[PDB]
Symmetry: C2
Subunit: 508 residues, 2 copies
């Protein structure tokens, strides 16, 4: 039907195929440099082109999909068969990394598309994992705690038996329908059965509860990275003027589509950065307030009343699905894929679109806005990878068998106080009077609060900034304009390809 | 088109293979369930409780447990690269390793490997082979690749399958199938032994169908054919069914039409021609030949070997409407080609009194029903009668675990014991009758003694299993008054064995 039109003309394209289209755009930018960098005096130019083309060809398709079925007895005593999948898109680095969904939506093509995006996300943030994705095809709200635990423990055993769960092979994480209690159950099941000799059993999964080896700073990480991603680009006048904006995040109006975890923490960090979140669009409501909604009050009001609607500090915006077409400086899509498509891209008045969700903009809509010349799209596989980065830190913490800062916080504090007293001694000698030299209020507060989350945050921010700058240099180098998505894919593909070339692949 | 896939299974023209097997499974499940409940010893469960547990176990057995799908690049011989897809299904892990062949074919799909992996579970159970069923495929046409490229593909699937637990002597043991043979089998064993399994004492037990030098077993090549013969033998000796279908007992003199002259059809025709049957027809994919006086298997194979086909075989006539030879009158029809060869639209034209399903799923449920109601056709079901190879593959796996070939430490010992016994009889006979009285192996025994070898142990084991399984099918069909529905008797026997594994391993809670 539609799926014969070109990809930049499709209305309801496949998710995996639109990711492959973004891959191809990126491979095209980078392949000349790759052929040029290959050096053999025993390879002809055709040899070199074929090898580069062959590695890029290998990267695109999912390496591996495990499909399983198993029985369970429901709490009522009857028996039912459950399906589950785990895709490992790329093993150029192991373990693979990616979440597990409990949803009726899960399908093989879905885990394939998102596992591929996971490969490019990890590469974007210099996280040494190939991408993976899993799903159990259940509506979890239809099951008791005990039924969910039985299902969770059974996928842990079956996945682990076949090499689809393990600290060195495949490390999952929460997704839609799962959370930290399921990760704690998977970790325990692994540690207690087929990983009972694994010294690093708790590194088999991330998003664990703190008491089971989880990491502080996980819950807000994705939202905090979206903020840092927006920050990296908002400081650039070249792109800010071409889209008609002034630099910096303070003052910018933000419409956020989705008040789940990522939208909420983005709102939190954006609000906490001086922005006005003038609109919240949800699946059945939308509140707007040109003054901006306060995320605490609205989270509380949503907590209290169950919904953002009628939010005392916010009018209900009706035609509530059209709040995203309202005028804003930044639109933050944080709900499902293909939210900006062929048929609505032109109605988007946002000057920046920060893709907090996976695949919110179809190739068709990406084109319309790029040709329009006044829209900066910050791509999903960069801007929404803050959680990926922190998950790497959680895996490391489990391999380390100690929390970050345990052996350094006091040592460093005492060293800093000794340094400050040395300066005070030196100053009082030079000026001949009492002159205290103490931490100011900010430094005193960070010293008093020093905790693992600070180390996580600093590490996240360091990575988001470096990755963002590399995407900018690439766009500039190839005169890609506001097409930061093609720049980001070129950078990620290049890293994957160079893994293959130094490993020396071919041997199949 | 698919209006068919809506009719009851027994009305369908082109049912799915996996749907056929599940319908056949349900027929066996239905017969056997009351006994299964009985077999559940538990003072803590009511009979209601036990009926529920049994139905949960049967619900678990039917669907394929696991499927691994992989893609990987290969460098063609000229230097450009191509991505290749492969699958491995493990239908049941109630016993491990799983067992099943690997196809190199363009026809391999996830659903065919699934349908045939389930069949494998029931085949292995039919012949008391302690493996769950498995099936694999690489989606290539192998004749479009050089030997070098086939070896690279073969070694890569060995590595990727073994890393994920889809190749190994205790987890999953493959075998040849369409598009593969013993050289690929030897390449997989060597790759396994040299990489993922380099600390495996029993690395060569990772796969069967191996060349002899790599640990293959004598008697593998004709084993499926020899089992088809012995399965037909067990039933031809029963007058209750030979009469009902209008036949005399015994294979000697019976007329045979074989559909397909691949490995299975050729070795069936050799064993049936020996033993005294008359193979009057051979139907292949483009020809048929016929000779109402019987076709000699060795002359035919030679002629095909020299010319490339059975066409114009001097010892027969070409039969035209060549795709219609299987409707000609014969005592035994041996379908030995593709699945669903007998279906709703042609079943009535079968004149064979006995159909021996050498192929997998040659008779659709629609046709199976059409021929059962006629009352004059005995179908010997695939998952029993074509399981001679599975049996011998179990023996090949055991030989690799044993690290010695069968008879190496017994042939001479038993020969010398047998000579001493015969010499003892001779001494006793000469003393009692007072004259010279030689007591020696007769010509048959002396021939068996001189040629004693691993193939003989394999053959005797194969025959022993085929006979016991065939007799257990007949006993089950008698007990449940199934008549000539031997298929439903076979699935009932297969299901019961799988179920009893679950019952003793325990499924009460999980």
């Amino acid at each position: 039907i539609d799926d014969l039109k070109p990809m930049e003309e499709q209305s309801n394209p496949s998710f995996f195929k639109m990711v492959d289209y973004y891959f191809d755009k990126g491979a095209t930018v980078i392949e000349p440099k790759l052929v040029e960098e290959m050096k053999s005096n025993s390879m002809s130019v055709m040899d070199k082109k074929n090898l580069v083309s062959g590695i890029l060809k290998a990267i695109k398709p999912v390496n591996k999909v495990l499909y399983i079925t198993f029985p369970i007895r429901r709490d009522n005593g009857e028996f039912e068969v459950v399906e589950a999948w785990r895709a490992q898109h790329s093993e150029h680095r192991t373990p693979t990394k990616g979440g597990i969904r409990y949803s009726l939506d899960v399908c093989e093509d879905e885990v394939k598309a998102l596992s591929a995006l996971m490969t490019y996300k990890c590469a974007a943030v210099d996280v040494p994992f190939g991408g993976a994705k899993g799903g159990v095809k259940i509506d979890p709200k239809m099951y008791t705690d005990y039924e969910i635990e039985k299902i969770t423990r059974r996928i842990a055993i079956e996945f682990a038996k076949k090499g689809f769960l393990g600290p060195g092979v495949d490390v999952p994480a929460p997704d839609m329908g799962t959370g930290e209690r399921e990760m704690g159950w998977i970790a325990d099941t692994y540690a207690q059965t087929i990983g009972h000799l694994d010294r690093d059993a708790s590194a088999c999964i991330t998003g664990k509860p703190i008491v089971a080896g989880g990491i502080h700073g996980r819950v807000s990480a994705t939202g905090r990275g979206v903020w840092k991603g927006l920050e990296v680009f908002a400081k650039e006048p070249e792109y800010m003027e071409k889209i008609g904006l002034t630099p910096g995040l303070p003052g910018k109006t933000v419409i956020i589509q989705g008040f789940g975890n990522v939208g909420l923490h983005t709102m939190r960090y954006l609000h906490r950065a001086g922005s006005k979140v003038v609109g919240i669009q949800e699946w059945d409501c939308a509140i707007h307030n040109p003054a901006g909604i306060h995320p605490k009050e609205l989270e509380d009001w949503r907590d209290q009343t169950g919904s953002i609607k009628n939010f005392p500090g916010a009018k209900n915006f009706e035609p509530f699905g059209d709040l995203i077409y309202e005028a804003c400086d930044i639109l933050v899509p944080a709900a499902c894929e293909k939210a900006i498509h062929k048929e609505n891209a032109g109605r988007i008045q946002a000057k920046i679109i920060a893709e907090a969700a996976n695949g919110p903009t179809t190739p068709a809509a990406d084109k319309i806005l790029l040709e329009r010349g006044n829209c900066l799209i910050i791509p999903d596989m960069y801007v929404n990878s803050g959680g990926v980065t922190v998950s790497y830190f959680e895996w490391l913490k489990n391999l380390n068998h100690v929390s970050y800062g345990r052996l350094s916080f006091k040592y460093e504090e005492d060293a800093n106080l000794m340094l400050l007293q040395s300066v005070q001694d030196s100053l009082e000698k030079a000026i001949g009077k009492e002159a205290p030299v103490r931490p100011n209020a900010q430094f005193a507060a960070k010293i008093a609060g020093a905790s693992e989350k600070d180390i996580v945050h600093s590490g996240l921010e360091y990575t988001m900034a470096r990755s963002g700058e590399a995407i900018i240099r690439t766009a500039r180098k190839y005169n890609l304009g506001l097409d930061m998505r093609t720049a980001a894919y070129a950078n990620s593909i290049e890293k994957v390809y160079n893994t293959y070339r130094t490993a020396g692949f071919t041997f199949t």
